[PDB]
């Protein structure tokens, strides 16, 4: 039977899914920035050694 509890459960699942996706994207972006900064620093050090 279609009852507001079922609608609430469906909506809750959809919201959980979207929120998880966004959080994963944010973590990926942060890691990309960290890797880029480390890479730039290492390249600068290599240039200094030359």
């Amino acid at each position: 039977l279609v009852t507001p509890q079922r609608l609430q459960r469906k909506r809750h699942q959809r919201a959980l899914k979207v929120r998880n996706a966004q959080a994963q994207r944010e973590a990926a972006a942060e890691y990309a920035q960290l890797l880029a900064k480390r890479l730039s620093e290492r390249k600068a050090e290599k240039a200094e050694i030359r």
Binding site: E30, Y31, L34, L35
Partner: protein, 258 residues
Amino acid sequence: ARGPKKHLKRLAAPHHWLLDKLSGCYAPRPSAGPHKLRESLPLIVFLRNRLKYALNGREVKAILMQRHVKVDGKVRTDTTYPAGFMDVITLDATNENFRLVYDVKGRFAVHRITDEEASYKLGKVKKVQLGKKGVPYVVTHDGRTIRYPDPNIKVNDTVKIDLASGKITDFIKFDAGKLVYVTGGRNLGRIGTIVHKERHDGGFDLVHIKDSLDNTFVTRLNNVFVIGEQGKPYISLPKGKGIKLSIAEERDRRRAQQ
């Protein structure tokens, strides 16, 4: 046998639990969990045989079902949940926080901690590997999978994990001069500083550890856990500070304090 075992005789149980050999015939078998069977302290033994809060297993079940016990900031209800090294046990009603650390004798010791120090734990990085979709992750000694680690973190390093978020706050590289804690073998519970790591390709690495009393001992690398820099531990250490004392000196100290 035709399958996994589900019983544990008292005599076969780990020695360091300190179980009476005549109280019964069986001992708590720790369920599967973060820590290995032989290196874990089930909550029943901790609440009953160490803290003496519960008089028997049924009272322990009564405690757990009330949701008063938290392990690592999460409520557990299994009597035989395998709590182990560096796990934080919080009992809010008593306003008590404990960190499970081996004493010098090699047994889990009831160590009371402040709430702030209870906010985090330490984990030995057992593995560093790329997961699906090219996402690096680290597996620690307690089976925690943490994604997006700091790239400099390598195996055998230590990571300070915040329990609320399950993220790495800081990390310690395994290097000479670092403070380490022995978590296996006859030297279990001792604390010292690294002196040198012998490497043997295709074999077990050995690490030389010098104690504060300048005594030295060699231990397999699997049994070493980096806990901080010399004189600056990242956790509060139990009494004795991991110093092994001879039987004669123990007699002298015992007679003196008495």
